[PDB]
Design a protein around this nucleic acid. Structure first.
Ligand SMILES: [Mg+2]
Ligand SMILES: [Mg+2]
Ligand SMILES: [Mg+2]
Ligand SMILES: [Mg+2]
Ligand SMILES: [Mg+2]
Ligand SMILES: [Mg+2]
Ligand SMILES: [Mg+2]
Ligand SMILES: [Mg+2]
Ligand SMILES: [Mg+2]
Ligand SMILES: [Mg+2]
Ligand SMILES: [Mg+2]
Ligand SMILES: [Mg+2]
Ligand SMILES: [Mg+2]
Ligand SMILES: [Mg+2]
Ligand SMILES: [Mg+2]
Ligand SMILES: [Mg+2]
Ligand SMILES: [Mg+2]
Ligand SMILES: [Mg+2]
Ligand SMILES: [Mg+2]
Ligand SMILES: [Mg+2]
Ligand SMILES: [Mg+2]
Ligand SMILES: [Mg+2]
Ligand SMILES: [Mg+2]
Ligand SMILES: [Mg+2]
Ligand SMILES: [Mg+2]
Ligand SMILES: [Mg+2]
Ligand SMILES: [Mg+2]
Ligand SMILES: [Mg+2]
Ligand SMILES: [Mg+2]
Ligand SMILES: [Mg+2]
Ligand SMILES: [Mg+2]
Ligand SMILES: [Mg+2]
Ligand SMILES: [Mg+2]
Ligand SMILES: [Mg+2]
Ligand SMILES: [Mg+2]
Lengths: 99, 194, 203, 148, 51
RNA sequence: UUGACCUCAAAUCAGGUAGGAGUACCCGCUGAACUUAAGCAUAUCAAUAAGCGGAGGAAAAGAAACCAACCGGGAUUGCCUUAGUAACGGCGAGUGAAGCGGCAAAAGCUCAAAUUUGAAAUCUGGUACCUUCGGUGCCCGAGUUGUAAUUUGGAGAGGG
RNA sequence: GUUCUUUGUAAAGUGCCUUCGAAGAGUCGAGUUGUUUGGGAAUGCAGCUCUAAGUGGGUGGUAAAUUCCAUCUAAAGCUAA
RNA sequence: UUGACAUUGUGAAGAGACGUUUC
């Protein structure tokens, strides 16, 4: 970003007086918004939990947050996707406990 | 079979290649078409000039960024900075490009410069019928060439700050290599605490 | 906007409200014919999303297709050939069942043009699809500048050529390095790099 | 042109040029590179050592001219400066009105040290130079300006 | 009480509920149609009402 | 007992549409072996022949879920080149592209998701009149399980 | 280049302020199978099984955990040369 | 031909896994 003007090394590149271009809304693609934030809430308490979700929280308050994650990674196909789901559980679990 | 002292050839003809031979016998007569249809385009385009006004653009890759190249369009930043709308700019002789941004002032400034210099050099005819005729100029690109900038003068002063340029590169490279390693040995300096 | 709710409700296919719905509907759809005319898009939020519009000239069909691999229709297993091509039982169709769905309704309604389709249910034996069609000689569309494009002859049986949405999927049209063959069109791009170009003054 | 061809000379002699005992049959020994490791081995070793087996590292999706770094030797260098303009700088021999040569603009990517140049200062701008190339420049009253 | 598909309307009592909104699952999707000079109307709800 | 609605039917109902042919070139499906490897099964021939479905005057692709790692580039197609190269391969026979660069041609876009809610503002048809590739009025129907208008990410929307 | 028409109080563009900014699911993705590709711990395609998310998702030609960076905005569509 | 998963749902006896729950 702050280019050294030399053609190799730890930030190589010719020096250019820079601009910083107007930000694209496309880069805000997955952006939340109160709209969806609301509807997705309302569908949750209407539709309810799903099968694997029901066992997911079960592994949580039992055989650790660990073992639950490994299942969740197998079940959803990605580690990252699993952690983000296991997290979502803990917040549901949070609600049930301390209301 | 194999014999004699010859190079090993690799001629891919084991596949019914003759079903697919394209012999450009029409190279000649197609030039005539490509003309005759440029000619008759140039007509009904009234006095307009066949081609759009196109930007300067630096050209990508370490191989090629030394040169400068006509880009596709003008950004939206350059068009408003030229004091006109993109939507209207298209209807004149100008090419716009909504994807493609400015992170280099010296290409921006020199591109808004083209836009200004272009307007000033064309006459946009009024919306009714009657006009001041004007002859027909065919190329915008001939008229507004793109040239490569100035980088330096014919001569200057020798200035030797003593640093060898080789070694500057060497140390520069070593820097890269171990930065990660060093990023580690340091982390364990924080972790080396009581 | 009741749609945004449906879009997000439809996502919870393992919820009892939806399990129950799916369970009762896949039975109903089975007792009807393999192909039948549908009253109105069971997924109004979905038909819509794919370009369907509730008016005179938009038709919705539902269709059962049989699910699984393609058993090589060779007589008694006999391949008569090398051992590579001796396969029979693990061979997968290069198109998608949804393409088989689109194609089958489109021949029954050959007076309509196929716009798109979407899943609605499946079971061990069938995948279920609702297909959205459009009548190219019904004036409601012929005068509609948004959809008159499909009246053109160039879109005749577009689903049998893979110009539909599943059609462009299986045909592997997409930009990028992951699609070097299949993009400009598999075969066409093959014929390209397999053609010998000789100019008049040979190079 | 066929008129000059040997096969014109051969008409009327049986068997073309190809012999009576040994014919001109339809691929003795196999098509193309067949039996390289076998009956065509004596030719493959000698005339083509190294032909068989792997060697070195693989490189997926390699892009030539990521390595675009064409070379230039001091051996020339002064070619980069326009002829007529050259004489002028040659005698002026000054550290104060020294000529500038943008090698990267000339299309090069590294200066190498082959050969000798005259004691005249030159401002050489480039990416990468050899430890020896810049040594000679520096010793002729010039310097090296690293660019990109 | 008779909308097919039901998914059009299931989330309503709970949409109402969250907002306070009084609701009723009246009988008749064809009765609500008559109520707006049509054939069927699914839903119907007044907001203003003269005093 | 009366009138709606949903679904499903029937008519030589009112008007339409499909088939079949051609297939050099085009979009898919399906799919060999002869052959090459001096044998041969992987591989090769070949993602080819044959077989099937569907278009046009071109077809398809097309305004990036792209290329790049640059000072960045900017829909698609094509030619020159990349290059017989990176890579695949009993790493054998053999196969084998992409990015940049020059050129030809150039063109950009619209839906879904939004309360018109102070006015379904939209549309097929029948029917009368006219200036008939249609306009206007009337009537039935379609449509709120959403037809119009505004908005499509480059944005844009509501208010000042 | 002529002349009927018949459009207006209606359509559009631009400047600052502010608040919002809805963006496609049995999909993306993952496993496994077959097929294909120069694509090599897997290039595309398909079958079954699993099946998301919203500071998300995809890609970044060596698999994995972790931290950053970069680049576009999929699962709907039209379009001459 | 055998096993898993899918089609697959509701109530119990049990021996079992630490009033839910897989046999
Ligand atoms: Mg020809
Ligand atoms: Mg041109
Ligand atoms: Mg089957
Ligand atoms: Mg389609
Ligand atoms: Mg003789
Ligand atoms: Mg003789
Ligand atoms: Mg003889
Ligand atoms: Mg002999
Ligand atoms: Mg030998
Ligand atoms: Mg030399
Ligand atoms: Mg009739
Ligand atoms: Mg036909
Ligand atoms: Mg066979
Ligand atoms: Mg042959
Ligand atoms: Mg053989
Ligand atoms: Mg032989
Ligand atoms: Mg044999
Ligand atoms: Mg054939
Ligand atoms: Mg055919
Ligand atoms: Mg025709
Ligand atoms: Mg043409
Ligand atoms: Mg087309
Ligand atoms: Mg876009
Ligand atoms: Mg491009
Ligand atoms: Mg061998
Ligand atoms: Mg091949
Ligand atoms: Mg180019
Ligand atoms: Mg609209
Ligand atoms: Mg505003
Ligand atoms: Mg506006
Ligand atoms: Mg999208
Ligand atoms: Mg196949
Ligand atoms: Mg594979
Ligand atoms: Mg994709
Ligand atoms: Mg298209």
């Amino acid at each position: 970003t702050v280019k050294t003007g030399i053609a190799i090394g730890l930030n190589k590149g010719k020096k250019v007086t820079s601009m910083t271009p107007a930000p694209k809304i496309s880069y805000k693609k997955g952006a939340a918004s109160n709209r969806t934030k609301f509807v997705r809430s309302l569908v949750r308490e209407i539709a309810g939990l799903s099968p694997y979700e029901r066992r997911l929280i079960d592994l949580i308050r039992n055989s650790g947050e660990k073992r639950a994650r490994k299942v969740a990674k197998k079940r959803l196909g990605s580690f990252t996707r699993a952690k983000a789901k296991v997290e979502e559980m803990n917040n549901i679990i949070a609600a049930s406990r301390r209301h | 079979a194999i014999s004699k002292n010859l190079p090993i050839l690799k001629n891919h003809f084991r596949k019914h290649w003759q079903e697919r031979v394209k012999v450009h016998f029409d190279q000649a007569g197609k030039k005539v078409s490509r003309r005759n249809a440029r000619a008759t385009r140039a007509a009904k385009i009234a006095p307009r000039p066949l081609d759009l006004l196109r930007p300067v653009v630096r050209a990508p890759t370490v191989k090629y960024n030394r040169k400068v190249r006509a880009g596709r369009g003008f950004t939206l930043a350059e068009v408003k900075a030229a004091g006109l709308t993109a939507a209207y700019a298209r209807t004149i002789g100008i090419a716009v490009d909504h994807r493609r941004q400015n992170r280099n002032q010296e290409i921006f400034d020199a591109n808004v410069q083209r836009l200004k210099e272009y307007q000033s050099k064309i006459i946009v005819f009024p919306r009714n019928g009657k006009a001041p005729e004007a002859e027909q100029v065919l190329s915008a690109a001939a008229t507004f060439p793109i040239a490569q900038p100035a980088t330096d003068v014919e001569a200057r002063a020798v200035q030797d700050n003593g640093e060898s340029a080789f070694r500057t590169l060497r140390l520069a490279r070593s820097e890269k290599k171990f930065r990660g390693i060093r990023e580690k040995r340091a982390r364990e300096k924080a972790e080396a605490e009581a | 906007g009741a749609y945004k709710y449906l879009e997000e409700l439809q996502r919870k296919k393992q919820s009892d409200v939806l399990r129950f719905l799916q369970r009762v509907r896949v039975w109903e759809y089975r007792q009807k014919n393999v192909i039948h005319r549908a009253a109105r898009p069971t997924r109004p939020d979905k038909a819509r999303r794919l370009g369907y519009k509730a008016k005179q000239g938009f038709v919705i069909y539902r269709v059962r297709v049989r699910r699984g691999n393609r058993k090589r229709p060779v007589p008694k297993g006999a391949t008569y050939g090398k051992p590579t091509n001796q396969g029979v039982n693990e061979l997968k169709y290069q198109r998608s069942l949804r393409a088989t769905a689109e194609e089958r309704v489109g021949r029954r309604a050959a007076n309509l043009r196929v716009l798109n389709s979407y899943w609605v249910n499946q079971d061990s034996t069938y995948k279920y699809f609702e297909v959205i069609l459009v009548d190219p000689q019904h004036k409601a569309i012929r005068r509609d500048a948004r959809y008159n494009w499909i009246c053109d002859p160039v879109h005749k049986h577009r689903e049998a050529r893979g110009l539909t949405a599943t059609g462009k999927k299986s045909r592997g049209i997409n930009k990028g390095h992951k699609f070097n063959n299949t993009k400009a069109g598999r075969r066409k791009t093959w014929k390209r790099q397999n053609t010998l170009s000789l100019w008049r003054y040979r190079k | 042109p066929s008129r000059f061809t040997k096969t014109r000379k051969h008409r009327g002699h049986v068997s073309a040029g190809k012999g009576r005992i040994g014919k001109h049959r339809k691929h003795p020994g196999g098509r193309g590179m067949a039996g390289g490791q076998h009956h065509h081995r004596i030719n493959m070793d000698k005339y083509h050592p190294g032909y068989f087996g792997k060697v070195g590292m693989r490189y997926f999706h390699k892009q030539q001219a990521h390595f675009w770094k064409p070379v230039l030797n001091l051996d020339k260098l002064w070619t980069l400066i326009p002829e007529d303009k050259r004489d002028q700088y040659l005698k002026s021999a000054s550290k104060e009105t020294a000529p500038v040569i943008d090698t990267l603009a000339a299309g090069y990517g590294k200066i190498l040290g082959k050969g000798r140049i005259p004691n005249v200062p030159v401002i050489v701008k480039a990416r990468f130079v050899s430890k020896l190339a810049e040594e000679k420049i520096r010793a002729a009253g010039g310097v090296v300006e690293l660019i990109a | 009480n008779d909308v097919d598909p039901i998914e059009l309307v299931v989330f309503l009592p709970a949409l109402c509920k969250k907002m306070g909104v009084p609701y009723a699952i009246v009988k008749g999707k064809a009765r609500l149609g008559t109520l707006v000079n049509q054939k069927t109307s699914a839903v119907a709800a007044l907001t203003e009402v003269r005093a």
